[PDB]
Design a protein around this nucleic acid. Structure first.
Ligand SMILES: Nc1ccn([C@H]2C[C@H](O)[C@@H](COP(=O)(O)OP(=O)(O)OP(=O)(O)O)O2)c(=O)n1
Ligand SMILES: [Ca+2]
Lengths: 392, 956, 393
DNA sequence: CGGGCTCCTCTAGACTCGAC
DNA sequence: GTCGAGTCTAGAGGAGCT
């Protein structure tokens, strides 16, 4: 199974009661180990550059994990209650039946609340980012952060794009974002047909698309699109509309708000399933370990010093390297290759006695399973080129 | 066993005096004793009895000679007899001609007659002439060496010059050194060749000894630093024809003559690479053979002269013992280098951050030509250089539109990538920036390029202008003819902005609280700064000297007192000066210390004592550094080593100052040594005593020298220190300067430097009182001048003659100070030789497991096994006693005072340091030796403690 | 001009003027970072991650939930998590009694999730997994950058960069001193005034040895970092049971590892560096400045100049250099105002692609440090920027 | 008339040679 | 034919030891 392999290779982390289909989608436990965290960080980096760096007028937003909290219904998100206050009321002076009802009313009425979606945080920063662009619509706000939803409390890491666009080109911008997100998901996928787009209608009748990933059990909405309109922005900014309307041409227009909400955690699960001898053929832009350095013969000290220099060079060049030469007990070469393939290691480098003589090292490629001899000085350039070619 | 002098000085105990001078000594001359009393009471010194120090009872080993002199002659002859035989075998040997072709094989090749080459493991004979060539590009591993034997030529080739592998181990071992194993090796710098010998790094002391032709040249026809400078410039003046410089070519010209030697113009071993050496193998081997043959001829011409001018075998034995120095290190040495370099880099990065920020802030003065109004940066190069030459939202674009816009942008960008043709092949260096900023920035092509003015340092002449240093409210100004100084505004006779100087001075005087108004050093009118006077900064050596950098360590008190201030204010100036003070030693010695040739022994090479000891760590390294010591590098025949004789002691504010503390004995071994107390001062006293009345303490100076104790702080150095209120380490400099020729001006300047409270008048009065004193020190000076002015200046103890360039016939009245100081300094060197000979004799007779570690001009450190540390301490005390007795005997005094009979304390420590109790706190070692490296404090023991611990015996 | 106002108008900060006071900023009760401030914090977190995980031997990532298991602790002030539906269900619908309401409130303090205040507990939960990853070969470590909640009653959020170092008790003090020096050097590396970063040994209520780093803010020193020489008590509390699952291989013998916690405040660190950096120029470190290149245009032909600027942008972005497209701004401003704006935004370089570039390719490059204008060819700009960024590191 | 050394960095000056 | 950049060396002032 894929979940067991990910757990043993530290892509996952949890008890067997937590590594189940229902539990994984819940988000009530830290389902990612160190390699899984690195893969999720690679996914976040690929999302960020493809949406905030390579895109025009898209800016970063950071918002709190707590919301002001209101007595409005249909809010199942867990609330914040001060522990000392509850101890003070229950102990010390004794309240009455009515007083405790008032205390519970106050908690519902006035208390913190855990955010359910990143949409509100971006909408709160609408004015500052509008002033950042000199009121020139359109512009977008992006954020990667953990959101809390009732299941216990589940945590899902969401990458949400709130795109402020004029009412005229709302459908065009929505289709633009839909095709761009579909290409982004399919860019890293060995099976890009497993990603699908379906037109969906909101409970208020608003239109959108739900990007799925065809998991082995069924499609899960890894990403959801909505044409929310001006309702949410008007709700979050009551009063004068002058601060709501942005400058688009000679007109001032309240921008329609588009929600592009992904699930980096569910996306990481999708890419782990897509990547799956036992080999996780993760895309080079996503694989957490890209070089594995090992020694092959004696002397240990000189070979270890050569490997240390090579590791320092690769780290200075931004390539993630697994120091496999530091293991006190090393397995066979075949076992190391199998372990690296299960861990989605792009390349394996073995430094031997011949390296001291001429600088030629045995380089192995995960995708082709073909050995190759390459000079030491030409390893770094080869890896950098390969990563650049895979990126573009 | 208590004895007394006719002048009441406590002499040796009866048991020791009977075994040293013997009974039957002649009674003192009554007239001489009365004269000594009259001289001694004239200065109010007669009387004042001294407490009788506890007596000593030791059964010394038999002195199998006739007296002290004969005993030392016999010891030295026994020690240096076989090496003399090996040297003589070279002089009477005929050698086959230089082989036509040199073998390319690895190892040692022996050239027989007619150039035939044969593979041999190691040279067979005992006497060799050695020269070693090292490819400096690939580190310190030896590359090739050529040797001459009394019967054949020898050549050596390393595996790195032949095999040509991609990568070689950066840590050296005995395996990749030059194997050479009662053996003598001759060479111009035997120490450099010795440092590349495999067997020399073992803890066990191989009996191989090294005779150096440069040391013998210094002994015979040596030159002082002034004499060397004059001789090189010219390359009474008859000393030039009899002396030469330390270069092998000059020595060969002086002693052997004939065709001049030529060096390789390519210099492949220093500037070239390994491939060049492979291509030019035969040419380099021929040059090495030429050097070896010249060294052999020089040795032939030098050995009889050295034996005639230094007839005492103690001199040769001491040189041979000084040629086998050995310093042990461990894995902590690498940690020391890393940590010192890291601390140096951190402090230098902080200093460079400050300097670069100041420089960048200064670059904004180009706008409006405001740099012409800056009191500091008006004189820099602010010139520039020209660059040399030969709407509504459109909406989301579709996929094809995005592709077209991406490809059009690339194509437009790539089209211009070929317009580079119009630009010079050589890239200009920052034409936009001002010239002074350009000089501070490395060029983009440099392999060590860093952003900003990375080249800035406190030693540059622009740094004080950036920091806006003001001396008493006067901006600092540099004069090429007078060094650094400052400008005093108000004079009324790019132009210097004297108006800015006046404004700054007015602001400073109104802020700090100040009011022809300044006196300082002196107004030099040759600088001719418009509207300003140039006053030189006060230098620690006088008004004649020039100040090269106001960031010297002697300006830190002036920085703290507020006379010297920095423009930005706050602690920036004090921090800069404190960083400079903490990094100056490492800035000057990091290449020396880091590039020390450390050969790490494998566990097999280590003895069973090191491995079996509990302190042994299987994960630690064990090696040794062989210091490259010239046994006679001065006219005084002292040792010379570029680093270890210049190794700074541990200081709380000096990075890398724990250098000697890093010389750590391996487990199972300890370092036992001692420092001679008031060595040269007592030598001068005992000389003056033997010239006045022939008894200890006859002169007033000898009486002052003998009476006192170091522990109680009443010795002559401590007495002077208490009198003038300075540290004893500075009273040493004061007294030695007075002894060696310093006038009253030097005394005044030294007192003012070391005692900031004293004024000029107080220092002058103190100096004149201590120099006016028919004086106390008259006899010493008279005897020193009499020995110096003799037709054959020789050492009063061993008879070693002065260099032929310093004889009165050759030089008449010139360099007389050097020739009068030579007597005392060469007497100290004879003291060291006698100590080495006696210590070797005691170690050999009583089987003390140890070897000579290092000696620096008064110290004798020994790598003794921990089981025999106190035996070594007793042996060293005995050697001190015997050396003092030998001095007294050769000077005619048939007795020895008890005060100078023994060391104050013998230091038994696990590492080399000035004091046992020091934990060596240092910026690079902030926790100390015990916390970081786990070195406990050893023991400093006087004679009585050693007697108690060893039962007064050297045998176990 | 105050630093806070400048950082607010340049979008390093955020919030109303009642949130820009010193107490409000220190509390962490509101989002205090604009897009530039978020990018600066991301750069600081990336530098921390590099220096503490990438270049450090045996340091691994870990992610833990913001919510910790509920505990009936005596005086913990950690805010609790309750379901609003259940509160309505108890209060409304069927009517309970006075005693029942007491039972519910006691149950909240008994069994309810609590927001984390430190990252130590999350790191200790993944200790066995990292033992498995390293084959139980001590020493190793777990690093994590996340948000921790501090009661202030308002709730304050602070980003914490913590490295829990598991070292044998023999070298605990040596490793603690090494980490103290390493963190102090790391904080001083990007600082214009390394003297403002200090250290001071301190002890806790249980007498454990420790040290705290400080930054001399204009109002006073604040503990931007803490290093505690914790014992084995935390591991035993998190792992009550067999010691065989906690012990790690120190050399040749198994030892329960001593725990060192190195907790730094990334938000407070960003504030410290904003004060350290601060004509009005924020001299932020080149490895921390949010915007590294800024591009402009000339005076026609606009289409070709734009095309060239688009190509140069793409070239700079593909190499991993953040770029501010100042040419696309339709608002016209003089080059003096543009340069002042770039200075206040800590923009390292401002590129001016003019019409003369279309002839040869000479673009005027202005550096923030010296404010001097230097001409360079377009093909050489990317290499120069990469070299500058790799050399400032 | 302090002496005996050691080495360093910085700077000025002269020499050499390629590109315009 | 000429200007500017390596490149090499020599001298001066500072700093370690004794
Ligand atoms: N500035 C100095 C320092 C030293 N020496 C010489 C004279 C000393 O005899 C010898 C050793 O120097 P010390 O500083 O050890 O002087 P002492 O031997 O008197 O000191 P101590 O009594 O502590 O051994 O070096 C000198 O001439 N000038
Ligand atoms: Ca001494």
């Amino acid at each position: 199974a894929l979940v067991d392999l990910c757990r043993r290779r530290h892509f996952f982390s949890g008890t067997p009661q937590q590594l189940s289909t229902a539990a994984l989608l819940s988000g009530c436990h830290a389902r990612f180990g160190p390699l899984g965290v690195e893969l999720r960080k690679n996914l976040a980096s690929q999302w960020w550059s493809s949406m905030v760096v390579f895109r025009e007028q898209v800016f970063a937003v950071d918002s709190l994990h707590q919301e002001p909290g209101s007595s409005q219904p249909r809010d199942s998100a867990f609330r914040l209650v001060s522990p000392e206050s509850i101890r003070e009321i229950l102990q010390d002076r004794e309240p009455s039946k009515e007083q405790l009802v008032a205390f519970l009313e106050n908690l519902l009425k006035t208390s913190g609340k855990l955010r359910a979606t990143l949409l509100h945080g971006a909408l709160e920063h609408y004015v500052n980012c509008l002033d950042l662009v000199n009121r020139k619509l359109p512009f977008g706000l992006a954020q990667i952060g953990v959101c809390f939803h009732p299941v216990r409390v589940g945590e899902k890491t969401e990458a949400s794009l709130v795109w402020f666009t004029p009412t005229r080109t709302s459908s065009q911008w929505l289709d633009f974002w839909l095709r761009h997100r579909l290409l982004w998901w399919r860019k890293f996928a060995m099976s890009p047909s497993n990603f699908s787009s379906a037109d969906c209608q909101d409970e208020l009748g608003r239109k959108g698309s739900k990007l799925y990933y065809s998991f082995p059990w069924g499609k899960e909405p890894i990403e959801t699109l909505w044409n929310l309109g001006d309702q949410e922005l008007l709700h979050t900014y009551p009063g004068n509309v002058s601060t709501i309307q942005g400058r688009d041409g000679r007109k001032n227009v309240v921008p329609c708000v588009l929600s592009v909400s992904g699930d980096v955690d569910l996306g990481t699960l999708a890419y782990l399933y897509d990547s799956f001898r036992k080999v996780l053929k993760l895309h080079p832009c996503l694989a957490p370990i890209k070089v594995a350095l090992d020694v092959g013969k004696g002397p240990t000290v000189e070979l270890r010093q050569v490997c240390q220099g090579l590791l320092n060079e690769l780290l200075e060049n931004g390539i993630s390297v697994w120091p496999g030469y530091s293991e006190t007990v090393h397995s066979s070469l075949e076992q190391l290759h199998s372990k690296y393939d299960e861990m989605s290691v792009l390349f394996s480098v073995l430094v031997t006695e011949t390296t001291l003589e001429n600088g030629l090292i045995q380089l192995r490629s995960r995708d082709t399973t073909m050995k190759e001899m390459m000079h030491i000085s030409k390893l770094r350039d080869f890896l950098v080129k390969y990563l650049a070619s895979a990126s573009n | 066993q208590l004895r007394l002098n006719p002048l009441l000085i406590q002499m040796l105990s009866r048991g020791l005096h009977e075994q040293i001078f013997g009974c039957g000594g002649e009674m003192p001359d009554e007239a001489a004793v009365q004269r000594s009393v009259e001289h001694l009471q004239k200065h109010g010194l007669w009387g004042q009895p001294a407490t009788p120090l506890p007596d000593v009872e030791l059964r010394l080993p038999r002195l199998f000679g006739g007296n002290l002199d004969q005993h030392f002659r016999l010891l030295a002859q026994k020690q240096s007899l076989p090496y003399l035989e090996a040297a003589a075998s070279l002089l009477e040997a005929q050698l086959p001609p230089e082989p036509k072709s040199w073998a390319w094989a690895e190892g040692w090749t022996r050239y027989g007659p007619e150039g035939e080459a044969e593979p041999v493991a190691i040279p067979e004979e005992r006497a060799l002439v050695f020269d070693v060539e090292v490819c400096l590009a690939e580190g310190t591993c030896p590359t090739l060496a050529v040797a001459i034997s009394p019967s054949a030529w020898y050549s050596w080739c390393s595996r790195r010059l032949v095999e040509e592998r991609y990568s070689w181990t950066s840590q050296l071992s005995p395996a990749d050194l030059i194997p050479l194993g009662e053996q003598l090796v001759v060479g111009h710098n035997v120490s450099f060749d010795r440092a590349h010998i495999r067997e020399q790094y073992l803890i066990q002391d191989s009996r191989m000894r090294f005779l150096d032709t440069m040391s013998m040249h210094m002994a015979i026809s040596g030159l002082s630093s002034f004499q060397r400078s004059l001789w090189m410039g010219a390359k009474s003046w008859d000393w030039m024809d009899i002396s030469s410089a330390n270069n092998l070519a000059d020595v060969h010209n002086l002693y052997v003559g004939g065709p001049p030697l030529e060096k390789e113009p390519r210099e492949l071993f220093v500037k070239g690479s390994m491939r060049d050496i492979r291509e030019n193998f035969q040419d380099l081997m021929q040059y090495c053979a030429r050097d070896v043959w010249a060294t052999f001829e020089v040795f032939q011409q030098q050995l009889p002269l050295f034996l005639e001018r230094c007839p005492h075998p103690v001199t040769l034995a001491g040189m041979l013992e000084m040629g086998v120095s050995y310093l042990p290190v461990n894995q902590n040495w690498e940690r020391y280098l890393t940590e010192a370099q890291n601390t140096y880099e951190e402090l230098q990065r902080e200093m460079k951050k400050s300097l670069m920020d100041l420089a960048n802030d200064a670059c904004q003065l180009l706008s409006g030509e405001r740099y012409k109004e800056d009191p500091w940066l008006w004189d820099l190069e602010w010139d520039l250089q020209e660059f040399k030459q030969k709407q509504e939202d459109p909406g989301p674009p579709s996929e094809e539109e995005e592709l077209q816009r991406s490809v059009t942008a690339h194509n437009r960008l790539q089209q211009l990538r070929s317009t580079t043709d119009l630009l010079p092949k050589r890239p200009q260096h920052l034409p936009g920036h001002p010239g002074w900023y350009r000089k501070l920035c490395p060029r983009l092509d440099d392999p060590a390029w860093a952003p900003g003015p990375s080249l800035l340092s406190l030693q540059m002449r622009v740094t004080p202008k950036l920091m806006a240093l003001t001396w008493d409210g006067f901006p600092l100004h540099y004069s090429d003819s007078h060094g650094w100084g400052y400008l005093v505004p108000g004079r009324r006779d790019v132009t210097c902005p004297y108006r800015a100087i006046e404004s700054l001075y007015r602001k400073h005087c109104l802020e700090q609280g100040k009011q022809t108004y300044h006196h300082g050093n002196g107004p030099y009118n040759d600088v001719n700064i418009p509207g300003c006077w140039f006053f030189k900064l006060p230098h620690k050596d006088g008004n004649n000297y020039n100040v090269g950098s106001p960031f010297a360590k002697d300006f830190l008190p002036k920085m703290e007192d507020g006379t010297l201030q920095a423009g930005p204010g706050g602690a920036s100036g004090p921090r800069a000066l404190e960083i400079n003070k903490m990094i100056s030693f490492w800035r000057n010695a990091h290449k020396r210390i880091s590039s020390q040739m450390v050969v790490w022994l494998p566990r097999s090479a280590l003895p069973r004592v090191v491995t079996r000891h509990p302190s042994f760590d299987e994960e630690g390294h064990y090696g040794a550094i062989l210091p490259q010591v010239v046994t006679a590098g001065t006219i005084t025949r002292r040792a010379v080593e570029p680093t270890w004789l210049t190794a700074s002691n541990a200081r709380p504010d000096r990075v890398g100052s724990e250098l000697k503390a890093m010389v750590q004995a391996p487990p199972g071994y300890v370092l036992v040594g001692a420092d001679v107390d008031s060595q040269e001062l007592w030598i001068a006293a005992v000389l003056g005593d033997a010239h006045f009345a022939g008894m200890h303490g006859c002169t007033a100076f000898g009486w002052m020298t003998l009476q006192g104790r170091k522990s109680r702080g009443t010795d002559l150095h401590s007495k002077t220190a208490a009198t003038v209120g300075i540290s004893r380490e500075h009273a040493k400099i004061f007294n030695y300067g007075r002894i060696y020729g310093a006038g009253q001006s030097f005394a005044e300047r030294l007192l003012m430097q070391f005692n900031h409270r004293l004024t000029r008048q107080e220092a002058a009065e103190k100096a004149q009182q201590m120099y006016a004193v028919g004086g106390t020190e008259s006899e010493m000076f008279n005897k020193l001048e009499s020995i110096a002015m003799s037709d054959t200046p020789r050492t009063p103890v061993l008879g070693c003659c002065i260099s032929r360039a310093l004889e009165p016939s050759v030089v008449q009245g010139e360099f007389i100070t050097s020739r009068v100081n030579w007597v005392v300094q060469s007497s100290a060197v004879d003291y060291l030789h006698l100590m080495l000979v006696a210590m070797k004799w005691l170690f050999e007779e009583f089987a003390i497991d140890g070897r000579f570690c290092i000696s620096i001009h008064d110290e004798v450190r020994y790598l003794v096994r921990e089981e025999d540390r106190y035996r070594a301490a007793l042996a060293l005390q005995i050697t001190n006693l015997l050396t003092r007795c030998m001095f007294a005997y050769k000077l005619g005094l048939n007795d020895l005072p008890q005060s100078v009979a023994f060391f104050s304390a013998v230091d038994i420590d696990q590492c080399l340091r000035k004091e046992v109790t020091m934990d060596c706190k240092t910026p690079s070692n902030p926790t100390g030796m015990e916390r970081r490296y786990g070195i406990p404090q050893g023991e400093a023991l006087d004679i009585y403690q050693i007697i108690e611990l060893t039962k007064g015996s050297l045998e176990k």
